[PDB]
Design a protein around this ligand. Structure first.
Ligand code: NAP
Ligand code: NAP
Ligand code: MG
Ligand code: MG
Lengths: 411, 405
């Protein structure tokens, strides 16, 4: 819909260009005000921070400030459009941080595609920020970039395209498994796609109890089988499967779970018929899914379906993750977002969906009723319980794992 | 002091720090967010991919300045490091917002090597409409600003260097006018050879001063040609043929003293042998090279400006950078060049000759102001400044061809 596009263009240019403004949180009108905000008063917190570096969190915005950082090499589904073109998306990501977790964001678009240039530039920004959310950086560069920055920086570094997606889909999968009386240890999973998100999703499924041998990964050229060499790399190699299947169709034979992280249309009804009873179908290709819940329900009335879209039930929406994840990490002044923290967020999201849904949430969604089951197995994005459930569990995981530098006693 | 305690509480209370980032557009509903983020946010991205200039139409780039420091010369605190400088950079951003309506991301960078710092900062270009370098020590700051100006296609401006040059240059033009002087024959003595001093001398030459009429002194006295002690590439440029060796000897018959050094550096005896109607810029902080009363006591015909708000003629940098960047941003300029800097000088000098509104008088407690020896430049809280200076900078950018809008 190109007129919907025009609504978006107008939105971005109307009044003042763009979507963000930086304002003072303190009085700044009078000469007295400015004698505190600036010279000579501002020397006091500077001296305090020089003597005790931790006090940077007491006297600046650092403790609530995340950088959303991209080089614009994988923007949304638009591909490598460059950092300037990606800036609206990074401003938008920042707005989600603010609206869902109260976190201030500097969106930082970096003109560097070289891994060393990019990492060298970002590493030295640490004094500015309480955390770094890497965004829309293409695979496989994003794997090296994230791992290097996590090692080199002493503040949390988290690439949402990789792990946010894994966290929310993992939560959904745990619940889908519960609803269908499945054990993770025996569930057979097919992942369609082998990019930034598929890699992390596969890894978290294993972390949640799935076996590598029960997971088959497919790409643009079919099943990633052990021995294969076409279009292969270090990361695809890890998930190369001993299977005899070569097509997506073959891989789905008797499979329990389809995880779609590829492109629209990739999954048809015929492929659906041979899946196991109560098939679990996550069709997350944007903006159009691998399949529709209706086409899926038509082929398989017993199917459980999640997608990336808010107009269908069970949206695997990344906004369920990163805001609370950084809230918990920031509030404990943590030096990392580690695996313990990611898993804590999985389990918090999963558990929340199992609770009775307050009238407030139904009223937010037009009076729709929600109860845990096949049409509701992950929290709604506009449910205010999400921050309350996920952020403290992340904070507790940071303290338990020893990456917190500030204890939080209670909420 | 109670004031330090007040300052600490100001920073620590409420939301820690001094800045918040907010949405400038509606962002409460599913519909709102379908435009602010996916799927609608793809539209401006596609527009920008096709026509790069549209980044200025659809993002905050055109109103967004990075205040960037590695914390190596923070205020008068020296090399305290990037984190400890963060309160100062947040506060600088506050000034940008309050005086020019400019949004700032303060960026504290953990790199002291010129090369590493530059390589980290120049790739941030897509984010910003302009870069204000701040509180970076000399001589590294010269090399850094020079290199970034060569690499980046947005304005790069180190305020410590050029802000004081611009405002003191406006003050100097007016001082010369008042005392019937011509810049081409004025003899100037610059005390100090650091970040700000060097730029001051360069602005004076641009305003018509002759390089031969300028003597620069540092911690070891006059910088004379042939001297090697404590020299560098930048001091070398301003090395003088003069036989003077001390600040005292240099000031004999001098018209102007520009003090960018340390307190007490200027005594009354040096003042004695200055020319009639000596112009004295004592801008050392927090205590000037000499006080206004001690100066007029020695020389009653003296015209004096300082860096302090408690005396007349405050050479305050807030008179410069807000309008300079406002003008640069509004013309979507690729540079702040010498033409733009000079445009700011002349506009500031011109505003000072205008009648001072009661609003300004009221702002400063009924104190009247009329262009003269006690009023050489606009007051910092004069709201006319942005309206006067920024349009002149924009005109300069367009005339010199660095404007893209
Ligand atoms: N919460 C969500 O809804 C969510 C989150 C993240 C991602 N996604 C969606 O998942 C998709 C990929 O995201 P990404 O960040 O991972 O991108 P990516 O890094 O580019 O990954 C693309 C992957 O898809 C593979 N592929 C392309 N065509 C295929 C086909 N017909 N069949 C099977 N695989 C195919 C590609 O194979 P090759 O490697 O061989 O080229 C590649 O592995 C996008 O649509 C994204 O919108 C959704
Ligand atoms: N608008 C304003 O009010 C304003 C603006 C900018 C600066 N200032 C003030 O000017 C002074 C310099 O600032 P800056 O940033 O330029 O500092 P800077 O970079 O450190 O430069 C210091 C300069 O002062 C020289 N110096 C040290 N002691 C001296 C002495 N007794 N006599 C003469 N020169 C001496 C140094 O000489 P060596 O090279 O030999 O070390 C050096 O050249 C500071 O007090 C600053 O607060 C005021
Ligand atoms: Mg992303
Ligand atoms: Mg400064």
């Amino acid at each position: 819909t190109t007129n919907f596009d025009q609504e978006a263009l107008l939105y971005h240019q109307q009044g003042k260009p763009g979507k963000i403004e930086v304002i003072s949180s303190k009085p700044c009108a009078t000469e007295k005000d400015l004698s505190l905000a600036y010279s000579p008063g501002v020397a006091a917190p500077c001296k305090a921070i020089a003597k005790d570096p931790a006090k940077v969190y007491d006297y600046t915005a650092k403790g609530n400030l995340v950088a959303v950082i991209s080089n614009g090499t994988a923007v949304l589904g638009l591909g490598n459009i460059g950092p300037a073109a990606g800036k609206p998306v990074m401003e938008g990501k920042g707005i989600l941080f603010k609206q869902f977790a109260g976190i201030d964001v500097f969106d930082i678009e970096v003109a560097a595609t070289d891994v060393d240039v990019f990492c060298n530039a970002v590493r030295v920004l640490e004094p500015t920020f309480g955390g770094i959310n890497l965004e829309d950086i293409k695979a496989p560069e994003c794997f090296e970039i994230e791992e290097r920055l996590k090692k080199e920086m002493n503040i949390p570094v988290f690439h949402d395209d990789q792990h946010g997606t894994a966290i929310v889909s993992g939560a959904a999968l745990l619940n889908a498994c519960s609803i269908t009386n499945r054990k993770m240890e025996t569930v057979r999973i097919v992942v369609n796609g082998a990019g930034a998100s598929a890699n992390s999703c596969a890894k978290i499924f294993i972390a949640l109890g799935a076996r590598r041998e029960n997971i088959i990964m497919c790409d643009s050229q079919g099943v990633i089988y052990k021995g294969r060499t076409a279009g292969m790399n270090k990361y695809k190699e890890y998930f190369a499967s001993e299977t005899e299947a070569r097509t997506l169709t073959e891989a789905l034979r008797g499979a329990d779970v389809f995880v779609g992280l590829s492109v629209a249309g990739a999954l048809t009804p015929e492929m659906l018929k041979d899946m196991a009873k109560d098939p679990i179908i996550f069709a997350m290709a944007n903006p159009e899914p691998e399949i529709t819940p209706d086409k899926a329900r038509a082929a398989r009335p017993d199917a459980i379906i999640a997608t990336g879209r808010s107009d269908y039930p069970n949206q695997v929406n990344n906004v369920l993750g990163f805001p609370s994840i950084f809230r918990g990490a920031l509030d404990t002044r943590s030096t990392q977002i580690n695996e313990e923290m990611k898993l804590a967020a999985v389990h918090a999201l999963a558990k929340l969906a199992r609770e009775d849904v307050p009238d407030k949430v139904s009223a937010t969604y037009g009076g729709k009723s929600f109860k845990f089951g096949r049409d509701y197995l992950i929290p709604k994005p506009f449910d205010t319980r999400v921050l309350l459930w996920v952020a403290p569990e992340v904070a507790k995981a940071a303290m338990k794992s020893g990456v917190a530098t500030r204890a939080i006693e209670d909420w």
